């Protein structure tokens, strides 16, 4: 997250870290046994880390649970990042409490102008690299589809939305991928892609979760 603020420990209780020996992507806990993330975060050997703030220090509220099954969206296209969403089943159910909690799926899509909370452990610089140990937060609005398509001609599908600031300076970034965009208490987006981080006229692009709720529910019901 570039241009954000330190969330505070366990104030984003649905945020997870995906770990394969190191943090590599975020995700969101959507019930006690399932996480949603970005398909471009797929790999084998995932351990899901819940209840994290500092990802390098054991602080006392963590739950570390390995994945038993990953399901990348059937129509994921790694060249265009269309349908950049996957589901991860945990080997055992998490213990839910005030600091480890699920986030609700949306019943409707959020409109442009809605303010959302984006969070993650990704790079905090637009030029260069600096990776934080603690969770960073950013409040940002959903942008109109016209402004999103004007920023990224030929690249925005119906399964994507833009959020952020056209002036630059505030954005998600590398390492935030897969993490949540929460608006009015619902998961509306997944950190997916962008050109660089926090550049002028290049806002973040997010998977539009409201388009996937039927697939998510059906998949969980059968796996
Ligand atoms: Ca920790």
From Swiss-Prot:
PROSITE patterns named in the record: TRYPSIN_DOM, TRYPSIN_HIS, TRYPSIN_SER
First-tier enzyme category under EC: hydrolase
Localization per Swiss-Prot or TrEMBL: Secreted, Extracellular space
Residues annotated as catalytic: 40, 84, 177
Keyword Ligase: no
Cofactor binding description: Binds 1 Ca(2+) ion per subunit.
Reactions it catalyzes: Preferential cleavage: Arg-|-Xaa, Lys-|-Xaa
A molecular function (GO) term: endopeptidase activity
EC numbers for this chain: 3.4.21.4
Activity regulation statement: Is inhibited by scorpion cyclotide trypsin inhibitor TopI1.
CDD domains the UniProt entry points to: Tryp_SPc
PTM annotation: Subsequent cleavage after Lys-125 leads to alpha-trypsin. Further cleavage after Lys-170 yields pseudotrypsin. A cleavage may also occur after Arg-99.
Record Pfam families: Trypsin
Sequence ranges assigned to domain Peptidase S1 in this UniProt record: 1-221
Annotated S-S bridges: 7-137, 25-41, 109-210, 116-183, 148-162, 173-197
Subunit architecture: Interacts with SERPINA1.
Protein name stated in the entry: Serine protease 1
Lineage: Eukaryota, Metazoa, Chordata, Craniata, Vertebrata
């Amino acid at each position: 997250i570039v241009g954000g603020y330190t969330c505070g420990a366990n104030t984003v209780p649905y945020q997870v870290s995906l770990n394969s020996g190191y943090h590599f992507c975020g995700g969101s806990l959507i019930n006690s046994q399932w996480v949603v993330s970005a398909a471009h975060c797929y790999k084998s050997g995932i351990q899901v880390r819940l209840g994290e703030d500092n990802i390098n220090v054991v602080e006392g509220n963590e739950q570390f649970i390995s994945a038993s099954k990953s399901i990348v969206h059937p129509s994921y296209n790694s060249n265009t990042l269309n349908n950049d969403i996957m589901l991860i089943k945990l080997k055992s159910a998490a213990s839910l409490n005030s600091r480890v909690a699920s986030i609700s799926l949306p019943t409707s899509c959020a409109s442009a102008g809605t303010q959302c909370l984006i969070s993650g452990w990704g790079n905090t610089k637009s030029s260069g690299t600096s990776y934080p140990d603690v969770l960073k937060c950013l409040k940002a609005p959903i942008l109109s589809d016209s402004s999103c398509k004007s920023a990224y001609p030929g690249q925005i599908t119906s399964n994507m939305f833009c959020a952020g600031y056209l002036e630059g300076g505030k954005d998600s970034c590398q390492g935030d991928s897969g993490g949540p965009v929460v608006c009015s208490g619902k998961l509306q987006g997944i950190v997916s892609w962008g050109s660089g981080c926090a550049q002028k006229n290049k806002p973040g692009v997010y998977t539009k979760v409201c388009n996937y709720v039927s697939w998510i529910k059906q998949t969980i019901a059968s796996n």
